[PDB]
Amino acid sequence: ENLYFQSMENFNNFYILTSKELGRGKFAVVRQCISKSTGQEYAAKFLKKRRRGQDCRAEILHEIAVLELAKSCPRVINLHEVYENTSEIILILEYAAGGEIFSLCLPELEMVSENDVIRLIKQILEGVYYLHQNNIVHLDLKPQNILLSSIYPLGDIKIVDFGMSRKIMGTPEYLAPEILNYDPITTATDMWNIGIIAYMLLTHTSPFVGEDNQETYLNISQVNVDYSEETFSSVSQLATDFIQSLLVKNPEKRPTAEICLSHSWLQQWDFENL
Numbered sequence: 001e002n003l004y005f006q007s008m009e010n011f012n013n014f015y016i017l018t019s020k021e022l023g024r025g026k027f028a029v030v031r032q033c034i035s036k037s038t039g040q041e042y043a044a045k046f047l048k049k050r051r052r053g054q055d056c057r058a059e060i061l062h063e064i065a066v067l068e069l070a071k072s073c074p075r076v077i078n079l080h081e082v083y084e085n086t087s088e089i090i091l092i093l094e095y096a097a098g099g100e101i102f103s104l105c106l107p108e109l110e111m112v113s114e115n116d117v118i119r120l121i122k123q124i125l126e127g128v129y130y131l132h133q134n135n136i137v138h139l140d141l142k143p144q145n146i147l148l149s150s151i152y153p154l155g156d157i158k159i160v161d162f163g164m165s166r167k168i169m170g171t172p173e174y175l176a177p178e179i180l181n182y183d184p185i186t187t188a189t190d191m192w193n194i195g196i197i198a199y200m201l202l203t204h205t206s207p208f209v210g211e212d213n214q215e216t217y218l219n220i221s222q223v224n225v226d227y228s229e230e231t232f233s234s235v236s237q238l239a240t241d242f243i244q245s246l247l248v249k250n251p252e253k254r255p256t257a258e259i260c261l262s263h264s265w266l267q268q269w270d271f272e273n274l
């Protein structure tokens with residue numbers, strides 16, 4: 001096999017990897033690296049080219065094409081450089097030190113105000129609007145796949161993990177009903193996932209997970225979500241409406257990202273302004 005991207009010798013001449021492993025999946029690992037010249041931190045994602053007996057370089061190229069298309073959108077993580085060796089394609093990615101928005105959805109962490117959730121969702125919607133305007137549907141917008149540039153203080157959103165992206169069977173609890181019914185790919189699926197993200201940020205509970213997958217699937221297909229006074233006692237009606245407008249069975253009835261940006265819940269004046 002003939003290599004396309006810059007050589008590994010170059011990678012090691014230009015970067016040093018740190019002891020901080022950032023993430024690992026079955027066919028990928030992400031590690032922090034540092035430019036030897038500048039000292040700037042990046043995230044190096046090593047994607048295996050062979051998976052499950054299938055040559056996946058074409059798919060990796062598609063993922064690079066997407067990150068490149070969205071370079072001008074600061075809500076999508078930016079690709080800095082690319083290297084390649086025998087088994088791997090290595091993405092040198094903008095570093096986001098704040099971790100996953102998932103971290104903010106756990107009981108443990110409380111430090112996330114309505115102001116913060118409103119801004120994060122708005123930034124998420126800006127990134128998705130941009131993607132959709134370009135006929136890109138992420139298709140994997142779990143809270144794990146949106147990072148923050150900082151948490152001390154709370155920074156800005158960076159959508160990552162475009163491996164499932166497409167033009168207009170993963171982790172069960174975040175699959176949209178249309179995916180469970182083998183309907184085609186719609187931009188509406190991302191909007192369902194933004195419903196789940198708002199629900200998780202605000203309740204710190206997962207909206208559809210059951211005691212097992214079969215129940216998880218029953219909850220998604222029936223759109224059986226907990227809106228009891230107990231779970232929603234500290235959640236605002238406006239936030240409730242936003243969520244309830246996204247989490248509906250029929251994808252055609254979900255508002256677009258554009259319309260979501262005009263939702264009353266997100267209209268705020270910064271009090272510092274005249």
Ligand SMILES: O=c1c(O)c(-c2ccc(O)c(O)c2)oc2cc(O)cc(O)c12
Pocket residue numbers: 022023030042043045063067077093094095096097147159160161162163
């Ligand atoms: O974990 C990370 C991750 O997966 C990705 C990523 C981005 C785009 C892709 O298309 C992709 O496959 C992966 O970027 C990152 C950037 C960071 O600064 C820190 C990270 O931890 C990740």
